[PDB]
Each structure stands twice: as structure tokens, then as C-alpha cells.
Design a protein around this ligand. Structure first.
Ligand SMILES: C[C@]12CC[C@H](OS(=O)(=O)O)CC1=CC[C@@H]1[C@@H]2CC[C@]2(C)C(=O)CC[C@@H]12
Ligand SMILES: C[C@]12CC[C@H](OS(=O)(=O)O)CC1=CC[C@@H]1[C@@H]2CC[C@]2(C)C(=O)CC[C@@H]12
Length: 1364
């Protein structure tokens, strides 16, 4: 005791000197000593010294067994000469990061640590040898390893360091504020706060993110991996990615394993301190401060167990990001230059899957990776204390929980083989959705739509019944985190009681053990996640091996240093092949091109043209020969390559933008016509990111880029293949030809054209990969050989009401039945724990233990309920969630079918497919589990808080300020991290957009020697994602610190209010209070983890419910207002001053229509170009609502008739008739309303009987999407049959001569003539052949009636009808 005190001298010295040292460390402006190997090891002695200042402590705690609870001096000295070492190894780090080299204060610290250890050193030696032997070897070795460590640390701190050499001024913008951050301010992540403020008063945009720090800018971490991967090769004086990946990410992973080790060896302090508190709180002779001290250093040892952890995550997420960046960078570097053969063999859509998956799950593996050893050290240690505590019974408990690793992975393999192996129902349903969406027109003019509604409802209900048992087996992840704690504690206590009835249960056993099971159970449920992620990353690593071990394409295929005089391109009898094994396509080909000479290449289709130019660039492995060039080149691939950026970039292509040259190239290529058409000018987006440019324009822009690149040797490749002929002549005239700009440029042209030949200079004739004839066309025309044969708030948190909406979609008899039922379960759980307390403090007084068999019993029947009242809840939540989907999905679908055609016109059919794809997916199987786990976490927190309050009644005083602080931190997080999540989720996809673009364009990326220039772009596009995935990680950490002080300032108060009322209560209550206050910082991150996994997901319900009540304005059927049955046979059409327009506030297309055709008569409509005759058709079916004027049919107004009855009676043949995938029975009669014989009879008349009879499926002939397996004409025949079945008195035609051939036009006109003599006929067409024969014809012009009479009367009037 005269020396245990003496060891306190250096600790108190360093502690008191610390606040008078950080005010001088900041008096050094900036030194930034480089990380030498001395300072890298001056802080490894200290951490190891803490780890031997641990056994110097837990030896003291071993007195708990054998009875002797240690005196405070006997267990605080190792606990505080252990904390300072985590501060010695931290002033070592923070000093080096400042200018100081000779530490001064810290060398004194180590010196005193040595000096105060001299006296026991000068004493323990003499007492040992003289009196015998070991004499308590544990305190001996823990001392003499401490002495060696401190001596070595002093010696190493006696050395000098390098001069600061620091820097000049770095850069102006907001720099990453971890550099230039004081000691106390970087320990607690206080520097991030500036954004936590700015992330709440304003929104965040890319201009205001942390300008990323220099070490990891994705071009300094790729290099750190390329160097390792290169140096890790065969090395004779085979290679594996894993070795390089370790050698380049081992420095940042054995410095993030020290933190995990420190944390999980610092975590086993609190259960033992709790044991000390419980077993002093019973003692009435122990002075008061022996409990106050334990509470104090149960706080100051739990605001440090979770500060070397929330500071762990900062160092193993910012290495997950470095995995995700090094992998992507090296893969991109490879994919630029491998081979065209390897691309052809593999899939261009698969290479990109080497990011966003299959190489990003390395970012998802980093946090789980250290679990590999931290699980077998959180167990073989937490088993030890438990065994020490309850005895062998503990095994059973842990055994059960270990047993819960497979049966929590068995569902993870039943599910994931029950929701993706059978989600093809979703695939087929979304296919049917896409089919229904486009072509909705003909689907809606006739009443086919509700049959499709029935079809999709049936497939949906099939997809949901397979989703019932796809979520019940998810209520086994609400059985691990809400019902397993009680089960494991019960089984432990059960085996403990049954094995031998002589062992009582007291507070310091039961409650320490149930507070230690907590510590063991977090890294024993994320362990199955480890198995899953590691076993699906062990294949990703193999795949990245497969990609990186692919042959490059530079065996110096071309040399660009020497050339024959006056020549630009020459090849010496070379041979080329598209694959290293396949027969060479080219055999000993020889061409000598003079400078500036245009050369054309000829042949038939399949002689080897396109494989000539591809060989010149160096993408065709030459078996023999030497290919030469001199100067830059420009390549125009046949499948022209369009960059996924703006037109200015996609034409300038990394050059200097000169408006004079730029504009003249654009006009010479004849692309200004598109520019005047372009909606935004020459800045329009291109590619999948922009307007999908058709084939014609892509070659124009490619050729323009080539010519503006003004390289020496243009290697063209039939760019005029997919363009209009006349402009193509100008394209050759103004650009390629000698009159054009490129007279002095060595052009090489390969094309199938003929007319361009005479204007060329030289021509090369290709046959089976061999040259036959060379020379000018007028000279070659003398030969006339086989070549002659070639000739012929808007932004913010969601409103509260939407939550209610979701409840109204679950039934609202289930919402009460689930909220009330969790309230019941929480009451049961608190009852179980209170009963355990009243058992454990009962066992100490009662002389009779015979009563135990009751308490145990009821404990079971009071916690088993808490299982049976949670599972029976979680199912009735999942079995509500799918219900919540069902109705909700219906309420969307049944409205989108009922929307006006203008809704589908103003929309590109992409947004209305976003829903039914994702926004219906989130409410389908992403929202129900999240809300279930939120509702588990909230009630876990409630049960914990109420048990703490109940056990120590006066603790309620502080429960408000903790609540306000925690809510403040939660709100600040939910602002700033929401901003960052949005800003990062939208900036990552440009990486994969820039990829999937170099892969296709690797041919044209090279030959512009732009490969290096084109990977810096990938570096900056992943940099613009790193600079918003870093501050999100740090924001998460700053939150978790804020929610951790308010989860440790409650352990402090639980212990303190336990010790302040010692005279009142009995030990069974403080044990419960403290042991359930130790996990009020786990059920307080879980309740935020979910409350932000539901704020970013219940946006989906708002959107889905918003897509409703969208002005359907179309009642399918009416109440009793149906027109009289047998309605068509009257068949009279009559108008009264009709006028209509597409949209409100739109120029009238129809005006004052007053037309009438009698019953059974035939009539057509003709309109001049621009009259707007098409709309008339839709006006008959009430597609456009009658603006002014009632279209009366048979003396009845159609505006008061149900469409499903109104449209059924009429008969339409649409302008663009379409088939729908499925049988023919569906494609002619979904309602099954007609006899098959007449169907076949109509099919016979449809000129299709030979086709249907030739197929045994016939009526069941499975049509492709739109009947693509049939020809166009056959599709109009099928739709002609479609109209044939209905056979009503009213017939109307839509564009009988729109674009069909004259052959089928004759057939359709004849079919119209033969059967439809009696029935009323209306007609619209581009050709008067079917109209001139009508009894009466109306002529529509600019939306008014002009000529409504017989064609003979029209002939006399000589209008537009008779004009031509
Ligand atoms: C902590 C993290 C990592 C990242 C997420 O945590 S979050 O607070 O940053 O969202 C999810 C997750 C939960 C449990 C964590 C885990 C990574 C590995 C951990 C730290 C262990 O060995 C014990 C606890 C495990
Ligand atoms: C909450 C979550 C993640 C979601 C899981 O539920 S699931 O339905 O998503 O599988 C439960 C799960 C396990 C451990 C949880 C973790 C989220 C973050 C937590 C709370 C910490 O910082 C410590 C423990 C971590």
C-alpha cells in the first residue's frame, strides 16, 4: 500500500500537465513530422503497455471469486496507470502531428514512471531470491513486463526526430477539418459540428463538401495498389490479387485492429465494476465514497469503452472506402487496355457488374472483417467470466445462443431462395405492365382493359401468396433481438438451479451474468452476416482475378518512330486474327500508302474490309509482319461511339475549343440542321444520359469529332453507311474529298460504296484477306475483272399524415392489434425482469430455498408470454404489410388505367413504370420489415427506460434533459446526414456511367492516345463520390458520439442513484438498474438506426398514394343510365354544334361540328394536311371530353353513357393496330364472348386460316411482344379479325391506308366491302381509294365541316377530294 500509491505519481503528473501542454502544443503552428519507424513504434510500446496494464488490473478483480472484494487502492491504480497509457500513446500521436520532436513533457512522464518503479524494483528482487521463489508470479510478471515496457519507451523517447519540413500554404477551399484540429476536438469528432450546423440551416450541394485530403484522392490510393499488384508477379528471380490487396491495405488494418482490441478488452470492465458496486452496496461498513468512486469510474470507463469504438468505425469505414476505390481504379485501368476478343467472349453488361456489385461488397465486408478474430476473443473471454460467475451451467445458455447461428442462417438460405429464385413472378408481372402501358390506346378504345386488370390482379395475388411465407420467415429476425435474451437467461438459470440445489442465486451472480450476456451477444448475431459476406466475397475476389489476369494488346503491334520516305502507312506482309487461335482473317497483306493520299477499300460483304482498319490501330494480333505509321490518327467505328456527356465534350474531345474552327467543322459535317432542332443548342445531353440519338446522327458527330481532331492519318470506316444519300455526297465533298478540308490529310477509307470511287486516289481490292489489285479507279476500270462484279415543405421530412395513410392501408383493426400487442409484450418483459429482481434479492434472506421452484416456473410463464406476445405480433405485422401492399397497389393500378390519354402523352412511359417497379417494391417488401424492426426497437427502449425508472424511483428527475439532448442530436443528424445521403446516392451512378462507356469505346479511346487522359476522368468521378461518402461516415460517428454521452450519463446516474439510496433498498434492485442501464446505449442507436431507415423509405408510400385521384374523368359504367339494349342496330350518327380540344387552354382542333349520317349508311371523312382529321376518331369514343357540343348517336347523348357499355357496342380498327403477348384466344376474345366456330370462321375470312391450322397451338400460339413473330401485314389481318368478331351495326375505321403496303390494302378493302354492306361505316385514311366509293363523304378542313355529300357531288364541287 506504500507503493501502490507511489505508482500514482506519474499518472497525476501527466494528467495535471495535460491542460497546460495542449495550450503550448498549439503554439507550434504546424510541423507535421513524417511518420517514421520510430514514432510508428513509440506508440506500439504504449498500447502493449496498456494491454499489460490490463492483467495488472484483472488480476485484482480476481479477488471477487474467493470472496475478497478488492479495496479501491488495489484496483484503481492499475485502472488509472492504464488509462494514462491510452493517453501517452495519444500525446505521442498528437505531438508528432504537431511540430514538437523532443517531447519534453512525455519524456519526463516516462522518466517518473521508471523512477517510481525503482523502489518496488529495489524491493521485489531482494524479497524473492532470499526467501525462495515466485511469490505471487502474476503481480511479479505484470510488474516486470511493465518495467521493461516503460524503460524501452523512455529510451525510445530519448531519441530525436526529423525537422518539421512542414509545407507552404496548401489550398484555398474548405479543407478536410481533421487536419488542424485540437486534441480534445478530434477525439470527440467535434470538428464535424460545423457541417452539423450548416446541414440544418441550409441544404447541402457539392460546392460545400470537405475538399478531400491529399493522402486518399483515388489517384494516390490506386497507385498504392497498382505498385503492389505489379511487384506481385511471377518473380522467378500465378500472381494473386489477395497478396497485393493485403500488402497495400495492411498498414490501415493492423492500426484499426488495435482499436478493436483495446475496445473489447475495455468492455469487460463494466460488468466487474457492477459486481463491485453490488457487493459494496450491501456492506454497511463500507464508506459512502467506495460506491461513488465506482459509479464515477464506471462512467469514466464507459465513456472510454465507447470512444475507442466510435473512433474505430472511423478507421475501418475509411478503409472500406479505400477498398471500394482501389478495386474500381485498378479494374478501370485494366478495362481500358485488354483485348477486343476478351470483350467479345464476355459481356459488356457484365464488366460493369465488376462495380456497383462484385467489387463494392468489399466496402460492405470491411466492418465485418475484424470480427474474424474479435468473435473468438469476445467469447473465449466472456465465457470465462460467466463460468467464473454461474458455473458450468453458463455453457448451456451460450450453447443455445451459438445454436441460434445456423437456425438464423437456415432462414437466410430458405429466404434468398424463396424471394429471388421465385421473384420471376415479379419479372413477368412487370413485363405485362410494360406491355399494357405502351399501346394503352387500342387497349382503351375497346373495353379490353378490365380483362388485363383481372390478369395482372391474378398474377399479383400469385406473387403475394408467395410473399406471405416470404415475410413470416423474416419474423425470425425479430426473435433474435427481442425474444432471445430472455430465453438464454432463462435456460442459464434453469440449468443453474437444477444441477445442484445447494447454490443460491444472488444479485451479483444473476445480474452480472445477464449484463455480460449482453456484451457477448452483439458480436454473435452479426457473425452470420460475416459468413454471408465473406462467402460471397470469396467469389468476387476470384472474378477480379479472372478479369485482371487477361492478356493486354500491345506487343508493339505498330511502331511509330520510322517510316519509308514520303509515306504515312505501310504494312509488310502482315497477318491478323480476331482471336489468338482462330484462323487468320488476313494473309500476308501489303500496302504502301503515300502521304496525304486517300485510299478506298472494296470487296463483297464478307471479304475482310472492316478487319483492315481494326488491324492498323493495333487491335488485331499480328502473327507476322511489321505495321508502321507516323503521326496521330482518327478512328470512326462502324458502330459509332457516343460519349455519355454533352455535345461540346463529345466533339471537342479533350482539345482547345476554338469557335471559328468548331463552327466550320459542324457546318461542313452538315449537323447545324440537328442543332436548330436540338432543344438546348450544342450543349444537349447525349447517350443514355440524354436524348437517344438515332443511327444517322451518331456517325455525323463521330466524323465531326474525327475531323476537328485534325490528326495526321484519318482511318475512316464507312461513316456514310447510315445517312441520307444527298447529304452524304456533301459529307464526302466538303470533308473527305480533295475539294474538302482534308486534302493534305492521309485518309484511309473502307466502305461498300461505289460512286465515291472515281474521286479517290488509290484503291485496294480485298479478297479472303488477301490483296489482289491496287491503283486508281480510272486505271483499275481497265481491268473489269471481279471488281466489275462488285458493282452489280417540398424538401424536408415527410408529413405525419402519410403515416396514418399507411395504417389505413393495413386495416386499422390491425394497427391497434399490433401497437396494443407490443405494449402488452413490453409490460410482460418488465414484469419478467422485476420478478427476477424480486427473486434474486429474496434468495439472500429466505433460509428456505424450497420456494425457488415456484419463481423459476412463473418466470418462464412470464417471459415465454413475452415471446408468444411478440411473434404473434410480428406475424400480424408482416401479414399486414403484404396486405398494406395489396390494396395500396390496387389503388394505384386501378387509377393509372383510368387516366386520360394526355397523361400518357405528356409522360414518356418511364415515370409510370418507375412505380410498379421500385416505389411499389419499397412498400412491398422493404417498408414492412423496417417498420417492424423500428417498432421492436422503440419498445425495447421503452422497456429498458421504464425498468431503470422503476428500480431506482428518483431517477426520473434527469429523464427529461437526457431526452431533450438526445432528440436534439437526433434531429441534427436527421438533417445533415439526410442531406449527405441524398447527395452521395445521386453522385455515385456517374461512375458506372463513365464506365460501361470506356468498355464499349476502348477501341476509340485508344488511337486518340487519350487513354491516360480518359482515366483521370474516372479518378475525378470517383473522387466526387468519395468527397461525399467520407463526411457521411464522420456524421454518423458524430451522431453516435452524441447518442453515446446520453447513454453513459445515464449509466453514471443509475449507479449513482443506486448508491445514494443504499440504506433504502436491497441489492436485487441496483443490479437490475445498472445491468439494464448498460444497454441503454444499444437500444438507443437501434432506435435511431431504424428511425432513419424508415424516414428514407416511407417517402415511397407518399408517392404511391399521390399517384391517385389524377382526374380520371371517365366512368366505365353508370348506375342505371345504360342505353336500351340492342342499341347499335339503329346506327344513326348526328351532331349538334360540336367542338373539342386536347388539353385545357389549347387551340381548338374541332369547331361547330353539325353532321349527320343515317341508319345503316356508309360514310367517310377526308381532311387536308393539317386539318386534324385523326382526332375525330377519338371524339367518337369520348377519349377527349366534349368541350362544346353533344355527339348524339341514335338519338341518345353519349356523354351520359358508361364507356364500358358505350365503347363495347362500337367497332374500331386503330391506326397502329398492335398485338399483345400471349395466345390467340386472348388476342381476340379476352372476355370469351363469342363462339369458337365464328371465331374460326372470322379467322378463316381473316386470310389467316392457313396460318392458324398449320400450328397445333393455333388459338394457343404464344405471340411475342406485339406479335413480332408475325409480320406486319399478318398483324393487320389479325386485327381485321378482331373487328370481325364483334359484328355490330356501327363500324369506324382509323387509317386504313396509314403505312401498309398496297397488297394488304387491297385485301382489307375487299374484306370491308364483302361483309360490312349493311352495317354503318366510318372511315379515315391517307388514300381516297376506299373513300371515293362511299355513298356520302364529309370533307374536314381546319376543324370545320366544308363538304358533306356524295363523292359525285364532291366531284361537281371540285374540292380537295376531287382536286387530285
Ligand atoms: C457497427 C456495425 C458497423 C456499421 C453499422 O453501424 S452504424 O452505427 O455505423 O450504422 C452496422 C454495424 C453494426 C454492428 C457492428 C458493425 C461492424 C462490426 C462490429 C463493430 C463488431 O464487431 C461488433 C458490432 C459490429
Ligand atoms: C439494427 C441492426 C441492423 C438491422 C438488423 O435488423 S434487419 O431486420 O435489418 O436484419 C438488426 C441489427 C443488428 C445490430 C445493430 C444493427 C444497427 C446498428 C446497431 C444498433 C449498433 O450500432 C449496435 C447493434 C447494431
Amino acid at each position: 500500500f506504500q507503493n501502490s500509491l507511489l505508482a500514482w505519481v506519474p499518472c497525476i503528473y501527466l494528467w495535471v500537465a495535460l491542460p497546460c501542454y495542449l495550450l503550448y502544443l498549439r503554439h507550434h503552428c504546424r510541423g507535421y513530422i513524417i511518420l517514421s519507424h520510430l514514432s510508428k513504434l513509440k506508440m506500439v510500446l504504449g498500447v502493449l503497455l496498456w494491454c499489460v496494464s490490463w492483467a495488472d488490473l484483472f488480476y485484482s478483480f480476481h479477488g471477487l471469486v474467493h470472496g475478497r472484494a478488492p479495496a479501491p487502492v488495489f484496483f484503481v491504480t492499475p485502472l488509472v496507470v492504464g488509462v494514462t497509457m491510452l493517453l501517452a500513446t495519444l500525446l505521442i500521436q498528437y505531438e508528432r502531428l504537431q511540430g514538437v520532436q523532443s517531447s519534453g513533457v512525455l519524456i519526463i512522464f516516462w522518466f517518473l514512471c521508471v523512477v517510481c518503479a525503482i523502489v518496488p524494483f529495489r524491493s521485489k528482487i531482494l524479497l524473492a531470491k532470499a526467501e525462495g521463489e515466485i511469490s505471487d508470479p502474476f503481480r511479479f510478471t505484470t510488474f516486470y513486463i511493465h518495467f521493461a515496457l516503460v524503460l524501452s519507451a523512455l529510451i525510445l523517447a530519448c531519441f530525436r526526430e526529423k525537422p518539421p519540413f512542414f509545407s507552404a500554404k496548401n489550398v484555398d477551399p474548405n479543407p478536410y477539418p481533421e487536419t488542424s484540429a485540437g486534441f480534445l476536438s478530434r477525439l470527440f469528432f467535434w470538428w464535424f459540428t460545423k457541417m452539423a450546423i450548416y446541414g440544418y440551416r441550409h441544404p447541402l450541394e457539392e460546392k460545400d463538401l470537405w475538399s478531400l485530403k491529399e493522402e486518399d484522392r483515388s489517384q494516390m490510393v490506386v497507385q498504392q495498389l497498382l505498385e503492389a499488384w505489379r511487384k506481385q508477379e511471377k518473380q522467378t528471380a500465378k500472381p494473386s490479387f489477395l497478396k497485393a490487396l493485403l500488402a497495400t491495405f495492411g498498414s490501415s488494418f493492423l492500426i484499426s485492429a488495435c482499436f478493436k482490441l483495446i475496445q473489447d478488452l475495455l468492455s469487460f470492465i463494466n460488468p466487474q465494476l457492477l459486481s463491485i458496486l453490488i457487493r459494496f452496496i450491501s456492506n454497511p461498513m463500507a464508506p459512502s465514497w467506495w460506491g461513488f468512486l465506482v459509479a464515477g469510474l464506471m462512467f469514466l470507463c464507459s465513456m472510454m469503452q465507447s470512444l475507442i469504438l466510435q473512433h474505430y468505425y472511423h478507421y475501418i469505414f475509411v478503409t472500406g472506402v479505400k477498398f471500394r476505390t482501389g478495386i474500381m481504379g485498378v479494374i478501370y485501368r485494366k478495362a481500358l487496355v485488354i483485348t477486343n476478343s476478351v470483350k467479345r467472349a464476355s459481356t459488356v453488361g457484365e464488366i460493369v457488374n465488376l462495380m456497383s456489385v462484385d467489387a463494392q461488397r468489399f466496402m460492405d465486408l470491411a466492418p465485418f472483417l475484424n470480427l474474424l478474430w474479435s468473435a473468438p476473443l469476445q467469447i473465449i473471454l466472456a465465457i470465462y467470466f460467466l463460468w467464473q460467475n454461474l458455473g458450468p451451467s453458463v455453457l448451456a445458455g451460450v450453447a443455445f445462443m451459438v445454436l441460434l447461428i445456423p437456425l438464423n442462417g437456415a432462414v437466410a438460405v430458405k429466404m434468398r431462395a424463396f424471394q429471388v429464385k421465385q421473384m420471376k413472378l415479379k419479372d413477368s408481372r412487370i413485363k405485362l405492365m410494360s406491355e399494357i402501358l405502351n399501346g394503352i390506346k387500342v387497349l382503351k378504345l375497346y373495353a379490353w382493359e378490365p380483362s388485363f386488370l383481372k390478369q395482372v390482379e391474378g398474377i399479383r395475388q400469385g406473387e403475394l401468396q408467395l410473399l406471405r411465407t416470404a415475410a413470416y420467415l423474416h419474423t425470425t429476425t425479430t426473435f433474435t433481438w427481442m425474444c432471445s435474451p430472455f430465453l438464454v437467461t432463462l435456460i442459464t438459470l434453469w440449468v443453474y438451479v437444477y444441477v445442484d440445489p445447494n447454490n443460491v442465486l444472488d444479485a451479483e451472480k444473476a445480474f452480472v451474468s445477464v449484463s455480460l450476456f449482453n456484451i457477448l451477444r452483439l458480436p454473435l448475431n452479426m457473425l452470420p452476416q460475416l459468413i454471408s459476406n465473406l462467402t460471397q466475397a470469396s467469389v468476387s475476389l476470384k472474378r477480379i482475378q479472372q478479369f485482371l489476369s487477361q492478356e493486354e494488346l500491345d506487343p508493339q503491334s505498330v511502331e511509330r518512330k520510322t517510316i519509308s520516305p514520303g509515306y504515312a502507312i505501310t504494312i509488310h506482309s502482315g497477318t491478323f486474327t480476331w482471336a489468338q487461335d482462330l484462323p487468320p482473317t488476313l494473309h500476308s497483306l501489303d500496302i504502301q500508302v503515300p502521304k496525304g493520299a486517300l485510299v478506298a477499300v472494296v470487296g463483297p460483304v464478307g471479304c475482310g474490309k472492316s478487319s483492315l482498319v481494326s488491324a492498323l490501330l493495333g487491335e488485331m494480333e499480328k502473327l507476322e509482319g511489321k505495321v508502321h505509321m507516323k503521326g496521330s490518327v482518327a478512328y470512326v467505328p462502324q458502330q459509332a461511339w457516343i460519349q455519355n456527356c454533352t455535345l461540346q465534350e463529345n466533339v471537342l474531345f479533350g482539345k482547345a475549343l476554338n469557335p471559328k474552327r468548331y463552327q466550320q467543322t459542324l457546318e461542313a459535317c452538315a449537323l447545324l440542321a440537328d442543332l436548330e432542332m436540338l432543344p438546348g443548342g450544342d450543349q444537349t445531353e447525349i447517350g443514355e444520359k440524354g436524348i437517344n440519338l438515332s443511327g444517322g446522327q451518331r456517325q455525323r458527330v463521330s466524323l465531326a469529332r474525327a475531323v476537328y481532331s485534325d490528326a495526321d492519318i484519318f482511318l475512316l470506316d464507312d461513316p456514310l453507311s447510315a445517312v441520307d444519300s444527298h447529304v452524304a455526297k456533301h459529307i464526302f465533298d466538303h470533308v473527305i474529298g480533295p475539294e474538302g478540308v482534308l486534302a493534305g490529310k492521309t485518309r484511309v477509307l473502307v466502305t461498300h460504296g461505289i460512286s465515291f470511287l472515281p474521286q479517290t486516289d488509290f484503291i485496294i481490292v480485298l479478297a479472303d484477306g488477301q490483296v489482289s489489285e491496287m491503283g486508281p479507279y480510272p486505271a483499275l476500270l481497265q481491268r473489269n475483272g471481279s471488281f466489275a462484279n462488285f458493282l452489280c415543405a417540398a424538401i424536408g421530412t415527410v408529413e405525419l399524415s402519410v403515416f396514418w395513410d399507411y395504417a389505413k392501408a393495413v386495416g386499422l383493426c390491425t394497427t391497434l392489434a399490433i401497437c396494443l400487442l407490443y405494449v402488452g409484450q413490453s409490460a410482460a418483459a418488465i414484469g419478467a425482469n422485476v420478478w427476477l429482481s424480486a427473486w434474486t434479492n429474496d434468495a439472500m434472506a429466505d433460509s428456505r430455498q424450497n420456494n425457488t421452484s415456484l419463481r423459476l416456473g412463473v418466470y418462464a410463464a412470464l417471459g415465454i408470454l413475452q415471446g408468444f406476445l411478440v411473434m404473434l405480433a410480428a406475424m400480424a405485422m408482416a401479414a399486414g404489410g403484404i396486405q398494406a401492399a395489396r390494396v395500396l397497389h390496387q389503388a394505384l393500378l386501378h387509377n393509372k388505367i383510368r387516366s386520360p390519354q394526355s397523361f400518357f402523352d405528356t409522360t414518356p412511359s418511364g415515370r409510370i413504370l418507375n412505380c410498379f417497379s421500385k416505389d411499389i417494391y419499397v412498400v412491398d417488401e422493404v417498408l414492412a420489415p423496417v417498420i417492424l424492426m423500428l417498432l421492436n426497437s422503440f419498445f425495447n427502449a421503452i422497456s429498458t427506460l421504464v425498468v431503470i425508472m422503476a428500480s431506482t424511483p428518483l431517477f426520473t428527475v434527469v429523464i427529461l434533459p437526457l431526452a431533450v439532448l438526445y432528440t436534439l442530436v437526433q434531429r441534427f443528424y436527421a438533417a445533415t446526414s439526410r442531406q449527405l445521403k441524398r447527395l452521395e446516392s445521386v453522385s455515385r451512378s456517374p461512375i458506372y456511367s463513365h464506365f460501361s462507356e470506356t468498355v464499349t469505346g476502348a477501341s476509340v479511346i485508344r488511337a486518340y492516345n487519350r487513354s491516360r487522359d480518359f482515366e483521370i476522368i474516372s479518378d475525378t468521378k470517383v473522387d466526387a463520390n468519395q468527397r461525399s461518402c467520407y463526411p457521411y461516415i464522420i456524421s454518423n460517428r458524430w451522431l453516435s458520439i452524441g447518442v453515446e454521452f446520453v447513454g453513459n450519463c445515464v449509466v453514471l446516474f443509475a449507479a449513482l442513484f443506486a448508491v445514494i439510496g443504499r440504506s433504502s433498498l436491497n441489492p436485487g434492485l441496483v443490479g437490475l438498474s445498472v445491468s439494464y442501464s448498460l444497454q441503454v446505449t444499444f437500444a438507443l442507436n437501434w432506435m435511431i438506426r431504424m428511425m432513419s431507415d424508415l424516414e428514407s423509405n416511407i417517402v415511397a408510400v407518399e408517392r404511391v398514394k399521390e399517384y391517385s385521384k389524377t382526374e380520371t374523368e371517365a366512368p366505365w359504367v353508370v348506375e342505371g343510365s345504360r342505353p336500351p339494349e340492342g342499341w347499335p342496330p339503329r346506327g344513326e350518327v348526328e351532331f349538334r354544334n360540336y367542338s373539342v380540344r386536347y388539353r385545357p387552354g389549347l387551340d381548338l382542333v374541332l369547331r361547330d361540328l353539325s353532321l349527320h349520317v343515317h341508319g345503316g349508311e356508309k360514310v367517310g371523312i377526308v381532311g387536308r394536311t393539317g386539318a386534324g382529321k385523326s382526332s375525330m376518331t377519338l371524339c367518337l369514343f369520348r377519349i377527349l371530353e366534349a368541350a362544346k357540343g353533344e355527339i348524339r348517336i341514335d338519338g341518345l347523348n353519349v356523354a351520359d353513357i358508361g364507356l364500358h357499355d358505350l365503347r363495347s357496342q362500337l367497332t374500331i380498327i386503330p391506326q397502329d393496330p398492335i398485338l399483345f403477348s400471349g395466345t390467340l384466344r386472348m388476342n381476340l376474345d379476352p372476355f370469351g364472348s363469342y363462339s369458337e366456330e365464328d371465331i374460326w370462321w372470322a379467322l378463316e375470312l381473316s386470310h389467316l386460316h392457313t396460318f392458324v391450322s398449320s400450328q397445333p397451338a393455333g388459338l394457343d400460339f404464344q405471340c411475342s411482344e406485339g406479335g413480332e413473330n408475325l409480320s406486319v401485314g399478318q398483324r393487320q389481318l389479325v386485327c381485321l379479325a378482331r373487328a370481325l368478331l364483334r359484328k355490330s351495326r356501327i363500324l369506324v375505321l382509323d387509317e386504313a391506308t396509314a403505312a401498309i403496303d398496297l397488297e394488304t390494302d387491297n385485301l382489307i378493302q375487299a374484306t370491308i366491302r364483302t361483309q360490312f354492306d349493311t352495317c354503318t361505316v366510318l372511315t379515315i385514311a391517307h388514300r381516297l381509294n376506299t373513300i371515293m366509293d362511299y355513298t356520302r363523304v364529309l370533307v374536314l378542313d381546319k376543324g370545320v365541316v366544308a363538304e358533306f355529300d356524295s363523292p359525285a357531288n364532291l366531284i361537281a364541287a371540285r374540292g380537295i377530294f376531287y382536286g387530285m
